[PDB]
Amino acid sequence: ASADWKPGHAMPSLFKVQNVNLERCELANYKQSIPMPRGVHMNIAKYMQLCQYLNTCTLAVPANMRVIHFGAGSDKGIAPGTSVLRQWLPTDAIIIDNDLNEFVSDADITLFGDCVTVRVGQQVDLVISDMYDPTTKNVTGSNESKALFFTYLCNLINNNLALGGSVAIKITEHSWSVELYELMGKFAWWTVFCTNANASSSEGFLLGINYLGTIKENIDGGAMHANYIFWRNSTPMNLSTYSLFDLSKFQLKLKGTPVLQLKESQINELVISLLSQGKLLIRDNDTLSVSTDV
Amino acid sequence: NSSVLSLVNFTVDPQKAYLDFVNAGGAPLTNCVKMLTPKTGTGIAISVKPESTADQETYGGASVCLYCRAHIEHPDVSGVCKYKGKFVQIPAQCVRDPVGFCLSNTPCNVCQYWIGYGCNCD
Numbered sequence A: 001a002s003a004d005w006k007p008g009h010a011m012p013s014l015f016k017v018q019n020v021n022l023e024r025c026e027l028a029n030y031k032q033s034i035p036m037p038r039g040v041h042m043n044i045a046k047y048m049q050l051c052q053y054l055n056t057c058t059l060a061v062p063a064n065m066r067v068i069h070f071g072a073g074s075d076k077g078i079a080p081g082t083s084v085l086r087q088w089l090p091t092d093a094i095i096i097d098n099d100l101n102e103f104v105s106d107a108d109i110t111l112f113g114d115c116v117t118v119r120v121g122q123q124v125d126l127v128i129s130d131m132y133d134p135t136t137k138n139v140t141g142s143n144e145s146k147a148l149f150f151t152y153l154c155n156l157i158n159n160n161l162a163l164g165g166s167v168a169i170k171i172t173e174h175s176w177s178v179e180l181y182e183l184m185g186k187f188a189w190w191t192v193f194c195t196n197a198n199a200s201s202s203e204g205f206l207l208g209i210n211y212l213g214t215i216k217e218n219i220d221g222g223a224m225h226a227n228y229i230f231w232r233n234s235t236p237m238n239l240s241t242y243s244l245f246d247l248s249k250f251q252l253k254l255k256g257t258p259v260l261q262l263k264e265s266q267i268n269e270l271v272i273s274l275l276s277q278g279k280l281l282i283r284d285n286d287t288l289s290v291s292t293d294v
Numbered sequence B: 001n002s003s004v005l006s007l008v009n010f011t012v013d014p015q016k017a018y019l020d021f022v023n024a025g026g027a028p029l030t031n032c033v034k035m036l037t038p039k040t041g042t043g044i045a046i047s048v049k050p051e052s053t054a055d056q057e058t059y060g061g062a063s064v065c066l067y068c069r070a071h072i073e074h075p076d077v078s079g080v081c082k083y084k085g086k087f088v089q090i091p092a093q094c095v096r097d098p099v100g101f102c103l104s105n106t107p108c109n110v111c112q113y114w115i116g117y118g119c120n121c122d
Ligand SMILES: C[n+]1cn([C@@H]2O[C@H](COP(=O)(O)OP(=O)(O)OP(=O)(O)OC[C@H]3O[C@@H](n4cnc5c(N)ncnc54)[C@H](O)[C@@H]3O)[C@@H](O)[C@H]2O)c2nc(N)[nH]c(=O)c21
Pocket: A025, A026, A027, A030, A130, A132, A133, A134, A136, A137, A139, A172, A173, A174, A175, A200, A201, A202, A203
């Protein structure tokens, strides 16, 4: 199947427009696993496939790109995804990563502790989150919207994300937020992307592409998660890493996206268009200051 | 892993400690971050982007650094790690122990290739 050669599946508008109740997620191949190349952590493939999909998105890619990576650590004390980001991003990009527990990584800055301790002084260009709270596995009653780190992430999008920046935030059947789905409406475009390397999980990356700061689409977040689940339940996904055979074009395009400072009054239509096409970032151009607070 | 790491934490020569442990049959440090690459690179030792050839594998720099992995002082006079934030090419016959290989070899000065593993300066 041709889809086996893609990095994964992106939620189609066919399911975005449905109106269904939230159902349980039942994947035919649930938790089945695919062998990886020898010694290669599965998260290498997961992050590479995510990056391959973002290569088809209108990502703003400036010099000194500001990237922050939450949930970058693991129980092995290492940071495979951060290394993929180092491989994927421009050499002059700044990676700040973070995790509750201690780890070591190839990021420029590494902050230990709860993501709420991470104080971002300036606006960033790209937010990756792979955070998941272990208590989410205690399924007791109804699957309701979750707070946890999503509160922090929602406030980040509203205050610390450049106009034109993008986010990729991990959700699962039970690890999701109404507010975060709603905020996808403030980007030029959005989807949920499921890697083929982990297609047997309800995991998906909630993607917001090119932040606009105003509401482009009014999204009922509770209903949209139900559509996401309806899509997962309707769509056969074969586990695969075939897309990683040809890595000749893996690196993120060096777009040289310009960074402008503008007042809200000066945005108008040309600027909005440039932001929506991944051709412009609006934010400060100072020195990035991302530290841990008390 | 915790055995050899806590071992190199009870000595003034961590490099010798690790090498004597794995030369005596100890299990190499696991969970080094092996990357998937095109075997197209120049093949140098340390590089901002992966540079594996068909005979090499690329590893995340921090993950093959003993001083990074064990959270102990780096020996570099500048205090800055030579590997962290970069990528390290390992001969493929040596992937059983990337950390041991890096502790046992040095990149050349003129050319940035591993002495004996690509350096053709003689
Ligand atoms: C999707 N799903 C969920 N459940 C049930 O609902 C519970 C919670 O569902 P979930 O939201 O955790 O979704 P899912 O199980 O798909 O997530 P998965 O375990 O694949 O985890 C995805 C990612 O979350 C992160 N993660 C999961 N657990 C942890 C953890 N404990 N600590 C840190 N990260 C974690 C990792 O990145 C992991 O790859 C499941 O543990 C199971 O009882 C299912 N049961 C059947 N029979 N078929 C299913 O398809 C199914």
